[model samples]
Target chain A: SEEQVAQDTEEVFRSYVFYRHQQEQEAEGVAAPADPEMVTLPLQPSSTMGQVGRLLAIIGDDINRRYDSEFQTMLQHLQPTAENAYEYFTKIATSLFESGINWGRVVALLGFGYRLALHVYQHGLTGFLGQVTRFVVDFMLHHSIARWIAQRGGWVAALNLG
Target chain B: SEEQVAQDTEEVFRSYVFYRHQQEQEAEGVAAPADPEMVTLPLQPSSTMGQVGRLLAIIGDDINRRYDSEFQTMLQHLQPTAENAYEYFTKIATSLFESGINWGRVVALLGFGYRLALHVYQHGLTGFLGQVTRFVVDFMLHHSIARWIAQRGGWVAALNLG
Candidate 1:
């Protein structure tokens, strides 16, 4: 029951984020860039949901085990200030996305990303920077799905209506 | 007319991206993070679409004026390698979204984001990185709205049906 509630809420939030982003993009009068040839990259796909889950589980464990040391290293190279919070969060999310990880990866990554942001904010920066960064990342992920539905407008409509 | 066509196409791509992310989120059974109280960051919102457009125009101008040096610096901090392309592009999009800039800002921002990705890919990184990043960001922005509609249901359904 808890898992189901979480899943439903996750879906709801995903749609909201997606909807907002789409509304903004349409306002801009831009087009999606043309898809080019040859999409394969260094990071391999999970090929199945099960594998992705396994990998994420491993990542979750890794974060629990090594986050402190990783945070220290990340701090030296990354400032994680509010001024650059957008850039920082974007970098983390986008990097993972490109690596073939999806919002599915957010559970582990967010725990990792948020903690890192908190540490950075606590140690170096102040104000609401840490909280905002965490908020922004979640906001982005939640809305990402909604944006998609609004843009496509077919099966999503029927699914919603039915 | 051309702009309208472009917008429509952009929306299509956005939905596709949302759909993909949604499926992935479902596959993983990960939940969206719970919302926290009060999210405020440094960037102020533009009260009107006109203002958003104006601000973005200025950003476009600034990019044109200073991109050369900035690109050089960005290359040092961020490589345009295929491995990280998605993250880099999403970071650009998500950062702007969190800044209170809407999709209306994407015309210039996407252009700016895409070009930067291209330059980094062409001059700094090799292979299909440039095209892929551009494609991925565009896809993300285009499908972003569709996902939202499906999640929220309601008016998006009728709009899509019509």
Candidate 2:
């Protein structure tokens, strides 16, 4: 059951991630950019669910695997400045679980989206910025709790079992 | 009235263009070796309505002038991509009616958020893309005609006659 869960989890996550990466590449009409070392690039990940779903339908699975394999290396190219590099380097969500449809990803994404909303305010472009904030609020109100519950099924089970 | 409608049409279309442009910039960050260009890049645009509103509160008046300048620069950076530069270069209505909302700023920030969401997706780890896509989808739906029409004023006016 655990393996089934893990496998199911990976499949769902992989499908989701791959769909996003491939869809992006296709949208750009360019292949994913490779790592600095010249290795092939993996599919790029997406930032929202609608995009992920749409893209998944577009790219299919095989391409996603090939592209995603190279994706890990591309991350190395992301940071340059001390602040940028450090902020980026420390973002390992190893224990946080972006791989699952759990509370952690919901929290992490919300925090990420919220902080992003705050930053855009600096640009003084409030119309779009307000739209963004509304999106975050909606997510916080609805998706975060739902996702947390879905991902933490065992916790629910335990609660019920107890 | 027809003239007003035509003008509003231009405003909404311009916002969509800006929104598309911003999304492309964010997606560029997912390179395995990372994009040096993106490293020094500033924050992304707003993705939700609340974010846009909050941004308005922060910038107050003089927001349009500042946003216009930024949009120019963003257009330059956004050239040579699948997303259209001309679309982003156009202007939106801000002075017409009530809410004191700056249409130009709103559209620019919305596009900015799109790019930011793309960047986030690109940078995400192997298994986290779907979650990001969901966020983006919500953004598009909320700000788009599909969602706007259901409101009191209908899509036409809620978008500031854009």
Candidate 3:
């Protein structure tokens, strides 16, 4: 099961990162790298809710720590699922791009996200990440959660939240 | 002294927002808002190191809170000095921009950064923010701090380190 998860995660990350890489290159009017390095992430899938939550938080901390250590010092930290999966991913991509993100770092971040999302996929929402992902996904899909956020701060503010 | 800081902060924020607003307008090819509402922030500058640190942390919390409450939900929190001050500001600006940021929210964030920086200027380092800002500013000015971070994780990685 563990190996299977890892294998699946590798595939997911490769596809996701490649798509983003292309998008980024197009946005910047740059040619694709000659055979970019494809990185695979570690997958420690959890069966129980307990391990899933723990591992999710562990990865969250790792992501936040890496962000703080690399891009922003004394930086604001956030839960992995703070801005919904989509926005969280966008924020990472946007920030890196503005900061003149490199392919190596892009791969690093995408790998992190892939590992995290796949981890949750295997275990289910036994943790905060699972719960947060639901809200983010639901919000993106224009569900009731989105309505509540819009009502609270208007759609403009709602989108900015996170 | 307090009033002066507040005045300076207001100017800083206004200038920052105008630049961003112009940049956004240029990117989208839109005309500027005629007589935009220019908001001034509440100033409660501190006299002591303790109060300044506390206030700084409070602003950090407020920024984090705003992020979670309106844009990103339940974000991880941190100090202004997190990520270098420059990048910290950039992240906030970039995040806001990608989210279709408006004038009011931009003003609020700039107020937060200004207050944090002014507070630090007044009291010096009573805590970690002072320490973090030092390295960040030094790094920006191309000092040894930059070299240290470069050695650890390349300058790009160093810049990203908060």
Best-fitting candidate, measured by TM-score?
A: 1
- Can you give the DockQ of every candidate in the order shown? 0.01, 0.02, 0.01
**Each candidate's interface RMSD, rounded to one decimal?**
13.8, 10.8, 13.3
TM-score for all models, in order of appearance? 0.28, 0.23, 0.18
Higher-TM-score candidate of 2 and 3: 2
What is model 2's DockQ versus the real complex?
0.02
Model 2 spans > 4 angstroms off: A1-158, B1-15, B18-65, B68-105, B114-152, B158-162
User: Model 3, range B1-162, lDDT digits (tens) per residue?
Assistant: 322332233333334333333443554665532223211222233323223323333333334454534332211232322223334545554554465433334334544443344333333212223222322232222223223323444322311212
* B137 Cα displacement, candidate 2 (Å): 4.8
Candidate with more favorable, higher TM-score: 1 or 3: 1
Query: What is candidate 2's lDDT per residue for A36-79, written digit by digit as tens?
Result: 21112123334233343233334343333443343344443543
Ten-residue region with minimum lDDT total, candidate 1 chain B: B33-42
Candidate 1 residue B125 C-alpha distance from true site, Å: 36
Error of 1 at B124 (Å): 37
Predicted candidate 1 versus true structure: per-residue lDDT over A1-162, tens digit per residue: 322322333333223223222333444546521111111111223323223323433334434445435644665666443334445555665655565433345443444453444454455443332233334434444445324333434112323221
Q: What tens digits encode model 3's per-residue C-alpha lDDT throughout A6-30? A: 2232333334434433443554665
